[PDB]
Amino acid sequence: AECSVDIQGNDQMQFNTNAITVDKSCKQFTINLSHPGNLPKNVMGHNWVLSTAADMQGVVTDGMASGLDKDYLKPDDSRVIAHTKLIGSGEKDSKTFDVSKLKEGEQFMFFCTFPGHSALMKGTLTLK
Ligand SMILES: [Cu+2]
Numbered sequence: 645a646e647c648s649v650d651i652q653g654n655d656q657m658q659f660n661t662n663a664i665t666v667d668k669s670c671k672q673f674t675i676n677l678s679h680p681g682n683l684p685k686n687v688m689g690h691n692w693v694l695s696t697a698a699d700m701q702g703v704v705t706d707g708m709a710s711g712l713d714k715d716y717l718k719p720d721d722s723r724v725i726a727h728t729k730l731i732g733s734g735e736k737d738s739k740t741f742d743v744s745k746l747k748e749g750e751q752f753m754f755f756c757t758f759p760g761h762s763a764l765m766k767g768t769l770t771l772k
Pocket residue numbers: 653688689690691756757758761765
């Protein structure tokens with residue numbers, strides 16, 4: 645059935661969705677991120693990072709303390725279930741991951757880890 649979603653992160657620090665549905669018949673799921681804004685990665689970079697709700701805060705915080713040089717993700721962070729590269733104005737990045745990494749019932753969160761962005765740039769992802 646459908647196993648993909650397009651998402652945009654813009655100059656206004658927002659994702660154009662705050663809730664993603666993964667159909668449990670999907671084996672793989674694709675996120676196609678784009679940056680339709682005009683500002684550079686060092687001041688308006690966006691990634692789409694997926695973790696459990698419970699892990700989000702640690703991923704965000706440890707990612708913040710890693711610099712831009714590391715795409716604002718802590719090296720070797722196993723809490724990261726899937727993620728795109730960090731992108732700036734005009735860039736795109738797509739990420740496909742295994743649905744076997746999700747479970748029904750649980751609330752996953754997707755978010756951007758650029759410093760601060762996650763106060764606005766976050767949403768839920770649910771398998772059903
Ligand atoms: Cu961002």
